[PDB]
Structures are given as structure tokens and as C-alpha cells.
């Protein structure tokens, strides 16, 4: 049954319990964005 | 061989395993002897050239057949260097493109020939001198920059020597290697050789290609950095007539 609109999904859907894992990766640890700042004194390009 | 290894074999002009013999000469075929020793003669009037086969070899000319200048006798792959001298530079170009594609096609890939063409032509960029007009008699020279001498010393300053050359199938790497501009040349396997040399001669770049100008941090000579477009100015209605009224002063 469609949540958005009580109207039934036309033609049956396989539904059931499936064991599902959460993996080592997460967006938390990824996702970074810089505008400016720390320029290395050695290579002179932004780093760290 | 198939797949990517083939495409390199090809793009690098590489004299393969199972060169599968081609006839150097025109003429008539004659297969002789089985199991003991297997050889094939393509003997025309005059010359009788003989092509000894592995014996295991799955030859694909049956006895009596008439044959062509550089025609395959045996099956297998074909040496693109043997093809050059036997049958010219175009026939070469036409082999390379059509073979490289023989794989992308065979697999699933669809790409336009022109790409492969653009690259292939570069494999033919240079030619070695035989009997010169100005420089030393052995040097490799860009096809175009020899015309800068051939159709130069046979027009205005006509005479001396038209500079005879030879067609020179350069593998993709080798050709990339022998590339005028030292800046570009530097980025390859031995930067010292380049600079050492280019320093002795007052060598200049001119920076035509891109690999060059990226090295310097210059604005690439393409797209918006194309000489044909980047000088384009935009003047704006009232700016134009007001700029006109300070020109006659």
C-alpha cells in the first residue's frame, strides 16, 4: 500500500525480513571541503 | 593474440610472434613437401623467392594460386615494419587502423575511426634522410619540415638537392619520444639527455602543443586558449560610438 497515497501498488510485491549489515564505511569519516588556508612551506600547495 | 595486448602491439608497431610470412614479391605459389619439411615458393618469371615454414604452420595459400606484393602466405599476425617497406606507408596506416578496430569491435566497443587515425598519422610523423641538401645525411626529420626544404629548394631558391627520404613507421612511444619541443621531451624516461642536448644547440620551444604549456603553467593553446578565438573583443553599443569620437583627435 503506498504510504504517500493510500492507493495500492498495482500488482503484488515480494516483502519479508532480510538480515542486513552496516559496513565499515560511513559518510561521517568521508566528506571534506576546503576553500583556503594551510599552505605547506615546502611545496607551497595547500596540504593539511 | 587479442584484447589490449593487441592494441599495444599495434599502437607500438611491434614485430609479433607468428609474423606469419608475407611474400616480398608478386608471383605464383608452389607448396612443397609434407610432414618432413614444409616450404613455400612464390616464384614469378625471373626471381624465385622461398619461404620456409614451421611445418606446424597453417598456411593459407594452396598450390598454384597467384600472389600479391606483401600478401600473407601463412595466417597469423603481420609485421607492420615488413609491410611498410614491401607495400608503402598508406597500406600501413590502413592496416593499423583496421586491426586496432578489429579488437574494440570484436569485443563490444564502438568508436569512430578518426580517433585511431589521428594517432596513427603521428606514428608516421618522421622520415630518415638518404642523400641530403643541407644537414647530415642520416638524420630523422618530421615529414612536413622536410617539405620545408624539398619544395623550398625546388621553387624560389631552386637547385642543390631535393633531399631524398624514407618512410619511417614509428611506434606510438618512439614517435612521442622524438618530439622537437624539449619541454615536452623532458617529461619522458630520461630528462637529462633532452636538456643536455637542447642546451648545446640554442634550442627553442615555441610551445605549440599542450603538454608544453601545462608544464609552464601557461594557458593551454586550445579551446579558449586557441589563438583563433582568444583575441576576440566585445564592444558594447554606446562604448563603440564614444570610442569613435576620440579616434579623430
Amino acid at each position: 500500500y503506498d504510504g504517500r497515497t493510500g492507493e495500492p501498488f498495482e500488482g503484488p510485491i515480494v516483502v519479508g525480513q532480510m538480515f542486513i549489515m552496516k559496513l565499515y564505511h560511513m559518510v561521517e569519516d568521508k566528506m571534506h571541503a576546503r576553500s583556503t588556508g594551510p599552505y605547506s612551506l615546502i611545496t607551497q600547495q595547500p596540504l593539511g | 593474440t587479442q584484447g589490449l595486448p593487441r592494441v599495444i602491439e599495434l599502437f607500438e608497431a611491434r614485430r609479433p610472434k607468428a609474423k606469419a610470412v608475407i611474400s616480398e614479391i608478386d608471383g605464383v605459389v608452389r607448396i612443397e613437401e609434407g610432414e618432413d619439411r614444409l616450404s613455400v615458393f612464390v616464384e614469378s618469371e625471373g626471381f624465385s623467392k622461398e619461404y620456409k615454414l614451421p611445418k606446424d604452420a597453417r598456411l593459407l595459400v594452396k598450390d598454384g594460386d597467384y600472389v600479391e606484393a606483401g600478401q600473407p602466405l601463412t595466417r597469423g599476425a603481420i609485421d607492420p615494419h615488413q609491410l611498410l617497406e614491401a607495400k608503402g606507408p598508406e597500406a600501413v596506416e590502413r592496416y593499423l587502423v583496421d586491426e586496432i578496430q578489429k579488437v574494440y569491435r570484436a569485443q563490444g566497443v564502438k568508436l569512430h575511426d578518426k580517433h585511431i587515425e589521428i594517432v596513427v598519422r603521428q606514428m608516421l610523423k618522421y622520415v630518415e634522410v638518404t642523400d641530403p641538401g643541407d644537414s647530415r645525411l642520416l638524420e630523422g626529420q618530421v615529414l612536413e619540415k622536410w617539405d620545408v626544404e624539398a619544395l623550398n629548394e625546388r621553387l624560389i631558391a631552386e637547385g642543390k638537392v631535393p633531399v631524398a627520404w624514407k618512410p619511417l613507421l614509428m611506434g606510438v612511444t618512439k614517435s612521442a619520444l622524438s618530439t622537437k619541443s624539449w619541454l615536452s621531451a623532458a617529461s619522458f624516461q630520461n630528462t637529462t639527455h633532452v636538456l643536455t642536448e637542447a642546451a648545446i644547440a640554442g634550442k627553442k620551444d615555441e610551445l605549440i602543443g599542450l603538454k608544453e604549456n601545462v608544464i609552464l603553467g601557461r594557458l593551454i593553446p586550445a579551446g579558449t586558449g586557441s589563438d583563433f578565438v582568444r583575441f576576440t573583443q566585445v564592444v558594447d553599443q554606446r562604448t563603440l560610438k564614444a570610442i569613435e569620437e576620440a579616434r579623430k583627435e
Binding site: - | 647530415r136 645525411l137 642520416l138 642546451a199 648545446i200 640554442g202
Partner: protein, 53 residues
């Protein structure tokens, strides 16, 4: 240049691909502006400090 343009015509063709070789460097230096002998430095330059921090 002379002695080589002569070693160009009448060699035994063996070490004749070394006679020709000499000229590339000779003529290079000839229409260059490079006086050879500059290959031997009296003064050695020092790369500016900030480029080697």
C-alpha cells in the same frame, strides 16, 4: 667541420657512424651561441633560498 666533411666521403664505413656523429655536436655548437668550454663552470650558481626552504 672541415676534417669531418672530408671524413664523410672516404672512410672504410666502419667507424664512419662516429665520424658523422661528431658533427651534430660540432655544428650544433657552431650555429648556437654556445661557446663550448662553458660546459666547464668556473662559477657555480646557487638556487634561491625560498625554492629550497
Amino acid at each position: 667541420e672541415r676534417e669531418l666533411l672530408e671524413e664523410m666521403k672516404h672512410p672504410s664505413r666502419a667507424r664512419r657512424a662516429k665520424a658523422r656523429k661528431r658533427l651534430e655536436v660540432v655544428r650544433a655548437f657552431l650555429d648556437s651561441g654556445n661557446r663550448p668550454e662553458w660546459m666547464i663552470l668556473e662559477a657555480v650558481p646557487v638556487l634561491p633560498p625560498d625554492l629550497r626552504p
